[PDB]
Design a protein around this nucleic acid. Structure first.
Lengths: 83, 93, 97, 103, 95, 97, 78
DNA sequence: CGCGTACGTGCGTTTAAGCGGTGCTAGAGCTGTCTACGACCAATTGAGCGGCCTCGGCACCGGGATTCTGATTATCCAGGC
DNA sequence: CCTGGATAATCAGAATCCCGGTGCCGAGGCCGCTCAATTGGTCGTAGACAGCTCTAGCACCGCTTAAACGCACGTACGCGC
């Protein structure tokens, strides 16, 4: 199955909840698009590293360890998924 | 397949500091990742200074100055005291 | 009837989502987004569910910290409403491109 | 040597020695120093290329650190690579914000 | 007198190959040597991380290749990949 | 005659952005470096190129901090930089907690 | 000493950064930030020198201290 | 201080998030055997860096001489009363 | 005829271009030693790769209802002055 427009699967109340957790009281209407793009700027910076790990391990399945090492490279290390 | 971890050691330390307190699996994974991250950071710092001082070994002094460089003041000082007392009572015994 | 003033429900949601730790983005749309993005880099890739969970945790933490800096910049800009220029200035000070 | 055998100018010997003595791995392959010297050679070629271009733009026959700073910060990918890198005697790019300009 | 090693004549030769009528100062030469050493340390440490992650004790050309593909930006990494693979094949052909 | 307040500032910006010379004098900064170094270890000597490296790194760091400070001041509807801009820049940068 | 970083010096540092107008407390805040940054880098370099068993702080310790702090400087034996 | 309105709020509607019962197989993982490429050691050799010498940029000082706005006073012209 | 703004000059300094010296240099190329790269040869084991097995990722299918969209209303917030 083809995958298209899944960036709009990140709904406006999800970005609202992420803003409420971040302490934002009032959110503009132009936020919910742009932050989504920043999420792409996050995700294309992360998985492109992890696939580069998965291409080196000669694997077709992206594991949790490749995501952990991709977060290790980006200076955004994560506890709870190995490493 | 044996998967090595620091589970029983963190369990011993936790029962030493809090006997009526258990840990969850996610928090245990976080603690085990923290131990490996701190180990890798201190070992990489000691390897860096060993490469700097033209020396093919890593002794207690390199780990000591790596702890003094990485950890903040009170934490580094207490870890320095703990490391030195452990090295001395390993040397005597 | 009853209708709360604007500004109370947002503060209550701030307190609620700062008290809790569960993921705010749903699992399946984010998983579809991750599969779409990774499909644009390499075709025929499988994903562990804990890998997508780690991606969700890291993305949610990064967006919460970005919203924190955005709210701080919007406060420094003599406002209470965040703007995309606040996001842009926070990413310029952070060094993100 | 091995630099003439590979079509490169950077030494395979020095890179292969520093890969072994640098405590990088137990065994170090033979195709690794050639690849690393080639990548270093392309990177210094691009940097020296843009530095020479900046030196010709500044009407100078010798590359100064100002030309190296212009070559790094003017290129997008070279600035992205050397983002946390301070160049001594390099300075900054001439950039004045729009509200600072007079009316 | 200690015999300190550097990349002076090598970067000088690469400069003469890309710009015959251009020189370089020693203040820029020290920056170029530190740049070569920093890129060397980064790519070698990235190969070390990949070898440690993939339970392999051998750093081959593939480890340096994925280190370059991780560290360098896209067009720069692609051109460095082509240059590296070209030089590896030219080293493999000769003996 | 008389110039407007702010034109000589722009001329100084255009002058110092094209130059590479260090803007802090060597002897007071060297005495400050030595005074800070005596607080960590007594009977210390300093190479001149070490003080030059410290001066270059500190001047570049302060120039980048002044860049982010001017960005914060422009975002705060001002043209004059302020310590609140420095505080917000060091807060988003992660230096100031 | 700390006032040895003069007001025209911080003025020139702001002119290089593109600052048009400078407040009065900017000089003191820049002095404090410079003192904190110099304290961190010189502390790391002093740790390097006291591990190297030397009484002379070299430029190598300064370079390694700046490499530690994520502010790696080119041009002094990197 | 005031103006205009954007985004806060609630409810009806609609959409698809989640559940947890089921089949499949593809690829991760364990294993087993052979080998070539990589370390190690020894003699050889030549590219590399110390020394030093010549030259090409090198420099911010200084007081005439060019030039580029800026405050400056004024002046003209078209529109409204 | 009065009056507000646009422009079209106006000289006037502040800054800028240009030439001359005392000044100490520092690039860059040759002489030459020398120790690390080269090369030949031997030991060995990490790993390549074809086998096996086996968890686990993917797909479907459908019960449930929490979650999201959008519309309507409006007040308090962004920004203009």
């Amino acid at each position: 199955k083809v995958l298209r427009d899944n960036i709009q699967g990140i709904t406006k109340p999800a970005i609202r909840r992420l803003a409420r957790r971040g302490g934002v009281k009032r959110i503009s209407g132009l936020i919910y698009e742009e932050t989504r793009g920043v999420l792409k700027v996050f995700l294309e910076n992360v998985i492109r590293d992890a696939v580069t790990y998965t291409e080196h391990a000669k694997r077709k399945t992206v594991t949790a360890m490749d995501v952990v090492y991709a977060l290790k490279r980006q200076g955004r290390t994560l506890y709870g998924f190995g490493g | 397949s044996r998967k090595e971890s620091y589970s029983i050691y963190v369990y011993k330390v936790l029962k030493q500091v809090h006997p009526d307190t258990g840990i969850s699996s996610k928090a245990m994974g976080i603690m085990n990742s923290f131990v490996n991250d701190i180990f890798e950071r201190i070992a990489g710092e000691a390897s860096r200074l060993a490469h700097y001082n033209k020396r093919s070994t890593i002794t207690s002094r390199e780990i000591q100055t790596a702890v003094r460089l990485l950890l903040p003041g009170e934490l580094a000082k207490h870890a320095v005291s703990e490391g030195t007392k452990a090295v001395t009572k390993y040397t005597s015994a | 009837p009853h209708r709360y003033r604007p500004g109370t429900v947002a503060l209550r949601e701030i307190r609620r989502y700062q008290k809790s730790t569960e993921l705010l983005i749903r699992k399946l749309p984010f998983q579809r987004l991750v599969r779409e993005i990774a499909q644009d880099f390499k075709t025929d890739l499988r994903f562990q569910s804990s890998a997508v969970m780690a991606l969700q945790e890291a993305c949610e933490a990064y967006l919460v910290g970005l919203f924190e800096d955005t709210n701080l910049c919007a406060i420094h800009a003599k406002r209470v409403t965040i703007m995309p220029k606040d996001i842009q200035l926070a990413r310029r000070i952070r060094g993100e491109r | 040597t091995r630099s003439s055998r590979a079509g490169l100018q950077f030494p395979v010997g020095r890179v292969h020695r520093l890969l072994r003595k640098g405590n990088y791995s137990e065994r170090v392959g033979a195709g690794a120093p050639v690849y690393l010297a080639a990548v270093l050679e392309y990177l210094t070629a691009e940097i020296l290329e843009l530095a020479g271009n900046a030196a010709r733009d500044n009407k100078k026959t010798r590359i100064i650190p100002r030309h190296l700073q212009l070559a790094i910060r003017n290129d997008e990918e070279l600035n992205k690579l050397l983002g946390r890198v301070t160049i001594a005697q390099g300075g900054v790019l001439p950039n004045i914000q729009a509200v600072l300009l007079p009316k």
